[PDB]
Structures are given as structure tokens and as C-alpha cells.
Design a protein around this ligand. Structure first.
Ligand SMILES: O=N[O-]
Ligand SMILES: O=N[O-]
Ligand SMILES: [Cu+2]
Ligand SMILES: [Cu+2]
Ligand SMILES: [Cu+2]
Ligand SMILES: [Cu+2]
Ligand SMILES: [Cu+2]
Ligand SMILES: [Cu+2]
Ligand SMILES: [Cu+2]
Ligand SMILES: [Cu+2]
Ligand SMILES: [Cu+2]
Lengths: 423, 423, 423
């Protein structure tokens, strides 16, 4: 699995004993916590040395253990599949440590993990929620309506956040026009907004990429007109100070200006954007999460996200396709600060529109592409066979801050292209 | 304005009251500070929860307010245009907090902010200070003279730093030759230098890119000859240990090696380089700033700068051009550590010379290009209309460490490419 | 030299006197430590102000000195060539400070520094250790054997670390097949492994890029068959959770799928991968280094390495080539988290295979290329002349965490391409 269930234990002294102490999640600060797991789940346990004696963790029945960690902060992660139901001791095997208190239970329960009923609006943009290709057609005047909306959203299972959005979702509406078009932009800022909002389009030519004409008071509306002079895949974002603050809170999206021919036909298109959120409390903390200004200006986020939320493209709104389809992903980074090393595990990019150029010839046969903040690209590939394909930033520590996504494709396990055993 | 006046407030207990406390700038550690602002200026207020009670900041006559912030370190920023002259109360709206002492005054003064008289040397290279296109001509021997100079310089309004430079400015002189040219380089280390200085040209072939031949004692001169074998836009930099130290202090420049044809004809060329400075005290602290080794080797800078200084390309040496003109920016990253997401707000790159290749086809219709430390690129675009165009690193938290520049182009606010109402 | 001997001194109060205190390496916590150096070494001294009085460091016989550091954490670094054998005082020139105790000895000893005798296995891959170009030949079944081995490795001179590897070295085996080939992969997990291991190939099509078929218990074997459908230079890595943990401990390599025509003829090929290691104690600490989870998940490493170790490509297994040879470097980033700015000091890349595409035309005349984690590229250049050419990540603070390599080429100092003095 690429969604392991994760527990963090720090060694320490508590309740008059030498113990394991739970760190974050549902086990924060509990001593020798019960690790509750569902049958068939992959379990990851991170052991961190708290007080500076030698330690490990061992679960006899799964032939699983950490390495021995010796000094303060020394760490060892191990994993296994929870294949047998029942109750199992995790313990420290160092002389005396089990007797002295270093012992807890892993409970493997039958059936599938139930999802926590949500407490706030779903702010996640479905990756299929974009307009299809524009027909061949003359250049013309297009009216676009955006509303800036401030609202609490479901950031994770049991954690909320005050998002700022275009039309109550992250990313914002996928905008699709043809080069030469005249865009009539209307920006309504909701009555219940505390902040002024605006929009800079990277596909617009003139002051602030429209920001100078879109500074909108709450309950007010701006109207601006601009020509789409250049074909490309452009990120748009709020441009009201603090711009980094407006971007982290959710105010980014993509503007496709099709070239005259349109893009090469493909069977299926998807909308994906990466960003960071900068919270006071670390990744995995339950409750209302709040923004930490010191962490934002110092570029030290706690969440890395596809389309606004943890589980956005795994649990709530994943990608779906059929064997033999050509797939296109519009992938942009709102940021505000981090470059994505975009990759799909189990696939290779047939075409990569380098630096989001739609007019230059695409690069071919590419594993991984750098996309900067305030940049996008286009990738396509043919699905030659079935699987769960995984979208990642290949700076892979971002898996542990919520950045993973699923492309689900129905096919047999084994075939000519990849199979168990020899040829 | 894309240069808002920024104030940071931490809530706390001080002078026997529950108060706002100034953080950085002119208001550092003052309780309930007076925020002084000039008519028309954009004002940004950063509120940070200090002691852990619920707080906001409210200014009534501007219908401006932070969000409510609950736990320690929780934060909200808000902004507005200081369109109204006089004195206005900023205060906390939570039951009792204003009575308990959470109140200060915003003073809006008529007229424009006067410039601070400078303590130290202007070390900013004018972006228009470069030699123009070489004619067509035969390859030949070219003499180049560099001087390595240690001098105190104006990092910011009230703040100085010890710069290490090529010829007293940052970046160093723009060197321009043709492929085939034999370069006769004279490097003179000034008598009053403490340090050995040198140079490595990324456009030279041989040991240390000339560094092995140019290790120059203070008060001495070395001479080195090298052939420009490959066309490109190259960074040069000091190559005396510690090389990161000599770079952060400002010893970086660009060398253009023109291809046979020369580069395409353009109306106007500009010289811009990005670097970092690693100071003991945070961004905005007045006085002599000093270098912090721990922050240098761990890649934690306080300043992100175009051409040496805060306000380099906004206040003291901004960029000027006329509507209808095609513009080329030679953009390099001295670094020493951070990759730039280079972008011009309100413009699109007609051409981007990928990884600084002068011989491969440029990519077309690009919003944003990654440039690594020790790398450079060329961008160009036609100025279809007038406005303030803004050079940024689209890692936009670097806005709050000094990274912003202006390209000023005279023209009407409203026109066919972007305008106020509908069509 | 581009590998200086480095000493850090913090000023403070110890043993009843105002003194210098050693930081890190052989001098950690020693007062006025003896700085022992071999004749001809380049010496870098980092002064850090500890207690807040004014300090410098002066060595009279070498005309060498720091600048004056005033505030706590204020830093100045200086360098010189230890050209003179004997004992030289380093001392603070501020009034009284020398008399108050700020004085130590620099000892310069004749002859070269002996290498320290290792304690653990050599785990660095020789950059020359790769199979050469495959003939022209028909597509066929190729069998590959990989063994996952956990073992202590010589990380630095007197520091060790528990590495996880493919076949006992970092990077893993260079895999070379022809496009159209069928790969029969055998992965054996050694009996003495604590952990499950696996492999994902970025050049395989299907679930986990083979990870879904290769989750192998200790003392077990897995077998998977897959078709090489795309030509490219692909990273492969372990894909057992924690994937970031498995990668940082050393489980990455390169798979070249040759195109039918082969890569261009070249005189000499090399294998180089860049990674990070996240240790509890800082770079330079002797003894057993252990893994720091908190540093891994927050992207804050202590070691930046080519091919597994400090000195990997300078002392133990450097690169050798001859003047006039065309050279190819296959360069990959295992990571797990940092984008490399790959540069060879003294050279310029004739060709850069952008995003590791082997089917799109290579870019020409490039100084420096961004390679993401889980990305790879090919550079080639002609060696016109002799020198030590230096492999670096141009994020040059990484010089101070172990990231440097040597390409040694026998030839004269002075020729027509680069010489001392004028024409
Ligand atoms: O295979 N990439 O995580
Ligand atoms: O050439 N720079 O390391
Ligand atoms: Cu124990
Ligand atoms: Cu906004
Ligand atoms: Cu932008
Ligand atoms: Cu209050
Ligand atoms: Cu220098
Ligand atoms: Cu360099
Ligand atoms: Cu002193
Ligand atoms: Cu592994
Ligand atoms: Cu991968």
C-alpha cells in the first residue's frame, strides 16, 4: 500500500515507569498506547529515542522490529502487513526494559477502517471538474465569473482550517479559452469576507496580470477586460497582500489558453494543483488548525497538498480511467514557496510541455518534471495496463505531510507488460 | 502597491497591561506602537498571538480587521490603502481586551514618504549598466580588468553590511565577448582587502574555471588568458574558500559569450542577478548587520536580493522602457543556495533560453522559469502596453525578505489589451 | 585546493579565561585547540562570536586574519595555504584579549595527511563501475539479480552509519538494457536484514513500477518480469515504507534503457548519484552516526553525498580521464528530498539530456542543470585540456556537508586554452 497507517513512539519516563509515549495523531501523549489497526492494513511504526538509553520495538507474531536506537533523537522506522486478527505485544528487547515498563498492545480488528464524519465544507476540487476541449471556433468575447469566498474546510479526517478560495474550492475554477479571445472577468467578493481579494492571471498582459483592476471590497464586484494574446497553461492567484498568505489559504487555479488547433486529442483530462499550508501545530493534529506567520515567511510548512486537503485524491475525489486511454494531467503549483518534482508511480510521461509551453515541441519519455511555484505543465501518457497509479512530489518526505494521490485503473494483476514469476 | 508598508504585532503582557508589542523595524519591542504611514500607501498588518488568549486587530474608519487568533503563534494578516489622513485606533474586539489595554494609533500623514539619507556606499548595479551588442566582427584578443573590493554598503533604508564585490557593485561588471575570443583577464585585489579574492568563469575551460590562476593576495594583481570556446550566458564568481561566503557577500556576475550571429536584435537589454544574505538579526533590523555562519551552511537566509540591496530595483535603480519595445533580461542566480522561480507580473516570456543555452531553440509562451544557483537564462517579451511590471521569485514568501523589482513603462491605465469596465 | 581542512572557533569563557572554543571535528569543546595541518593544505577557519565582546583571529606569519565580529553569532571566515612548516599563534588583536587568554597554536607538519584506517565496509560505488554500451542486437530477455543488504559503512574518515543497499554499495548496480528487452528481475533480501525491501523502476510500466511484485521478507526472494517500453535514464529505488527512510539509507540506482540506435559514441562513461543523510549529530562528528526522523520528515539533512560517503569521489574512488577524450556522466538524484544544481567546475556541458529524455534532442552549451529527486540526466563534454575538474551541487553551502567530487586529467598547467600571464 502507498497509504500505510502511521504511529510515532518516543521512549521516556512516565507513570513511574520506562515506557513508550505516543507522538501526534490519536495517540499523542498516551503512555504505551494501544495501536488500533484494521486487517490487511500496512503499519509503519517510527521509534524515536527520548531519554538516551538503548531501545527497540519488537512484535513477535509479525517477525517485525526496529533497529536499536542509542542516543537522544536516534530513530528507526519499520513496517509490516497486519494480516492476522487479535492482540499482539510490541516491546523493547533490551535487558530489563520490558520488565521495567516498555510494552504496549497492537490490536488488529476485522473489517475496513470507517471514515470520520466531516465537520466542515468539502473544499477539494474534483480532478475531473474542468471544462472539455473548445471546438474549432473563431476568437470571441467570453464572460467569466469568479467569487472570492472565506470558509472553514475539512483539511484532514479530524482537522479543519480557514481556507480562502475562488468559488469555495481548491484549486479554483479551471478556466478554458482560445488564443485571441477577449475575457470579460467579473470578480464578486462575498459579503461575509474579512479580507479584500483580487486575481493576477499569468495569461494576461498588463498591470498586476489584472490585480491592479480587481482589488475588491467584501460585498463589492470588480469588472476587467483583457485579451488572451498567448497560448499556454497559466496559474492564476489572488494578488491582495499578503499574497503568500492569500495563496497558502487556497486562492490558486489554472487558465488554459488553447492554441488555434487546440491541444492534441486525448481520451481523458484531469485538473491537479499542489500547495502548502503553514499551521501552528504539526501534521496530524486534530482540531481547528491555525496559520503560523513565522513558518510562512521562513518557508517551513506542515501540510503539502493536492487540491486542498489530506485524502483529496485518495479518499474523497480520486482519479479514474480505463486501460487503453490516453490521459492528460494539467498540473500547476500554487505553492506559495515549493517546487514540485511531479511523478506518477508505475507510469512514464509520453509528452511533457516543458515550463508549460504549449507552442514549443513537448519532451518525450520523461520520469519526473520540476514545476516551480507560479508555474504549470501538461503531461500525457497511454495506460497500457491496469493498476493504482500514484501521483507524488518525488521529494518523498512530503508523503508524510499529506502529498499523495491515486489514479485507479481496472485490469488484471498479471499480463505481458508486468507479471509475477519469470517470462 | 507591491511594496506595502509592513508592521508585525505580537500580543502580550507589558507595562502591567494586556497589549500589542512591536516586532522588528522601527517599532521593535515598543508597546501599543504608533504605526506611521503616508497617504496612498498600501499597509500590511501581521498579527501574531503571543500569550494565548483570543485576539484580533480592528481599524473602524477603514472597515479593516484581522481574523480572530486563538493559540500561541496563531496569526492573521490584513491590508488596506491608507486613503484617509489623520489618527485612527487599532484595537482588539474580544470582550474586555480594549479596556484591558489592547489599543494603539495608526497615523496617516499627508504627502509622500521622504527617502532616508544613506550611511554607506550604493553597491547596487544599475540593470541598464551593461555593454550593448558587439557588432558582427572577427574573433580577437579582448582585455578585461576586474578589481576585488571590500566596502560597507546600504543593504536597506537604515541598515548596512560589509559587501565583497567585483568593482564595488553587485552584481559585478557584465562581461560581453564573441565565441572564439581570447580573453586576457587582469584581477587586482585592492590594498585594503582582508581576504584573498579570485574568479571562476562558467564560460571558461581549464582548472577552477580560471580560479587556480587568479588566487590574488590583497594589494596584488594576477593575469590569466583563456579562450571562450562555447556560446552561453554564464555566471562568474569568486572561488576563494569559503566560496559560499565570498558569493553571499556579493562576488558574482554574468559573462555573455555571443554566438556567431549575435543574439536576436531587441530594443532594450537589462542585467539582473538574485542572491541571499545570511544575517545574525532578522530582515528589517536597522544598524550594522553581520554574517551568521550557522545560517549560511544550513541555508537559512534573512535577505533575498536583486542586484545587492533592498529597494535596489524599486527605489534606487529601477528598470525603464517604452510601450512597443521588445525587452531582453539577462537573469542569473549568484545564490549561493536558492533556485529562483523567475517571473515578471503582467508579462509573459515570448522566448526563454532553457538552462541558458544560446544555441538550442528557445521555449515559447512561458510564465515562470526555474534558474539554479550558478545558472542563468535569457527571457524576452514585447511591451504591448504601459504599466508597472514587477520582477519576483514566485516563491513569494521572498517578497517579505526584500525580493521585488519594478519595470516602469509609461502608458494609459485603460486600453484594448486590459481595461476597467466590460467591452 | 577545493577540499580545504576546516576549523570552527566560538569565542567564550572557559578555564577562568576569555578563549577560543573548538566546534565540531577533532576540536569539539577544546579550549584554544591546536589546529594540526599538513604542509601545502588550504586552511579555512570559521570564527563565531559566542559571548558578545568584539573578536578577531590573526596569524602573523601568514598575513591572514578574520574580520572583527561584534554581536553573539556574528561570524567571519578566512583561508590561506599552509606553505610554512612550524608553530604559529592564532590570537585576538582587540585590546587586552590576547593577554586575557585568546591565543592558540596552528601546527603545520611536513608531508601529506595519512588516511585514517576504516572501521566499517567501503559502501561507495566506483563511478567507473558500470557496464559499457550494449552492441546493436535484437531485443531479448535479460536476467538481473539484486540483493538488498543492511550493513555499517564508512560515512566519513572516523564516522560510520547503518546503510541499506542494493548489493552492498551506494548507488546500487548500474542496470543497462536495450529498448524492447524483457527484464527477468530476481530480488533476494539477505537473511540478516531487519526490514522488508523492494524496488520501483521509473523505466517500468505497471503497479509500483514493480514495487507491488517485489515486497521481499528477509531470507526470501521475489521474481518479476517487465518490458522496457521506453528509452531513458531512470532512477530505481526501494519502495517499502518508510520509502524516504529506505532511500536516504542508500537504496537508489540508475537504469539506462538504450534507444535502438544507442547513445552517441563517447570515449568514457561515469556513474554518479547524489543523496542526503539525516543524522542526530552534525556533519564532522566522529563515531556511530544514527538516523534523526524529525530531521528526515522536515527536510533538514547533515550530509549531502555523491556515491554514499564523504570523500567518495575525492579520496576513495575519484574519476580519471585523458586529455582529448569525450566523457559522458549519467547523473541521478536518489534524494530523497533535494534538487541538485549539477555543475563541473572548469568544464561546460556540450550536451544536456533535458529531464533525462533520450528521445528529444539534447540542449547545447549549458553550465549547470537542475535534477530533481527521483530524476536523472546525461551530460557529455570534450576534455580539451588537463586539470582537476570538480563535481558540485552549485547550492554551494553543500560543500560544507560532504558534496564534492574530482575528475583528474593529466596535462600541462599552461597551454593555449588557459595559461598564466598575457599572450
Ligand atoms: O517511484 N516514486 O516514488
Ligand atoms: O564553479 N562553481 O562552483
Ligand atoms: Cu528499551
Ligand atoms: Cu485573496
Ligand atoms: Cu504570480
Ligand atoms: Cu485581545
Ligand atoms: Cu572573494
Ligand atoms: Cu561556479
Ligand atoms: Cu577577542
Ligand atoms: Cu528497502
Ligand atoms: Cu520513484
Amino acid at each position: 500500500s502507498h497509504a500505510p497507517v502511521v504511529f510515532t513512539l518516543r521512549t521516556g519516563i512516565a507513570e513511574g515507569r520506562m515506557v513508550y509515549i505516543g507522538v501526534g495523531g490519536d495517540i499523542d501523549r498516551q503512555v504505551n498506547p494501544k495501536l488500533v489497526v484494521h486487517e490487511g492494513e500496512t503499519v509503519q511504526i517510527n521509534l524515536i529515542n527520548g531519554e538516551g538509553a538503548q531501545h527497540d520495538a519488537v512484535i513477535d507474531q509479525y517477525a517485525a522490529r526496529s533497529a536499536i536506537v542509542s542516543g537522544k533523537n536516534a530513530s528507526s522506522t519499520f513496517s509490516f502487513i497486519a494480516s492476522k486478527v487479535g492482540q499482539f505485544d510490541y516491546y523493547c528487547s533490551l535487558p530489563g526494559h520490558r520488565q521495567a515498563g516498555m510494552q504496549g498492545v497492537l490490536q488488529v480488528v476485522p473489517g475496513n477502517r470507517a471514515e470520520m464524519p466531516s465537520t466542515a465544507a468539502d473544499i477539494t476540487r474534483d480532478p475531473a471538474d474542468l471544462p472539455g476541449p473548445i471546438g474549432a471556433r473563431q476568437a470571441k468575447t467570453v464572460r467569466i465569473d469568479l467569487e472570492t469566498v472565506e470558509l472553514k474546510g475539512q483539511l484532514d479526517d479530524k482537522t479543519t482550517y480557514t481556507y480562502w478560495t475562488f468559488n469555495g474550492k481548491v484549486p479554483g475554477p479551471f478556466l478554458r479559452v482560445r488564443v485571441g479571445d477577449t475575457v470579460e472577468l467579473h470578480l464578486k467578493n462575498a459579503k461575509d469576507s474579512l479580507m479584500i481579494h483580487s486575481v493576477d492571471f499569468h495569461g494576461a498582459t498588463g498591470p498586476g496580470g489584472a490585480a491592479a483592476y480587481t482589488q475588491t471590497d467584501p460585498g463589492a464586484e470588480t469588472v476587467v477586460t483583457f485579451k488572451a494574446l498567448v497560448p499556454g497553461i497559466f496559474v492564476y492567484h489572488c494578488a491582495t497582500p499578503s499574497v503568500p498568505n492569500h495563496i497558502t489559504n487556497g486562492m490558486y487555479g489554472l487558465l488554459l489558453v488553447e492554441p488555434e488547433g487546440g491541444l492534441p486529442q486525448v481520451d481523458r483530462e484531469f485538473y491537479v494543483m499542489q500547495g502548502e499550508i503553514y499551521t501552528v501545530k504539526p501534521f496530524g493534529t486534530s482540531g481547528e488548525q491555525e496559520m503560523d506567520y513565522e513558518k510562512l515567511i521562513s518557508e517551513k510548512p506542515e501540510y503539502f497538498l493536492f487540491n486542498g486537503s489530506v485524502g483529496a485524491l485518495t479518499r474523497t475525489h480520486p482519479l479514474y480511467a480505463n486501460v487503453g486511454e490516453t490521459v492528460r494531467i494539467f498540473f500547476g503549483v500554487g505553492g506559495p514557496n515549493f517546487t514540485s518534482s511531479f511523478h506518477v508511480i508505475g507510469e512514464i510521461f509520453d509528452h511533457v510541455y516543458a515550463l508549460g509551453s504549449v507552442t514549443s515541441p513537448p519532451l518525450t519519455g520523461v520520469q519526473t518534471v520540476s514545476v516551480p511555484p507560479g508555474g504549470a505543465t501538461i503531461v500525457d501518457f497511454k495506460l497500457d495496463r491496469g493498476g493504482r497509479y500514484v501521483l507524488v512530489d518525488h521529494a518523498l518526505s512530503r508523503l508524510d505531510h499529506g502529498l499523495v494521490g491515486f489514479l485507479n485503473v481496472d485490469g488484471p494483476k498479471n499480463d505481458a507488460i508486468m507479471h509475477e514469476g519469470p517470462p
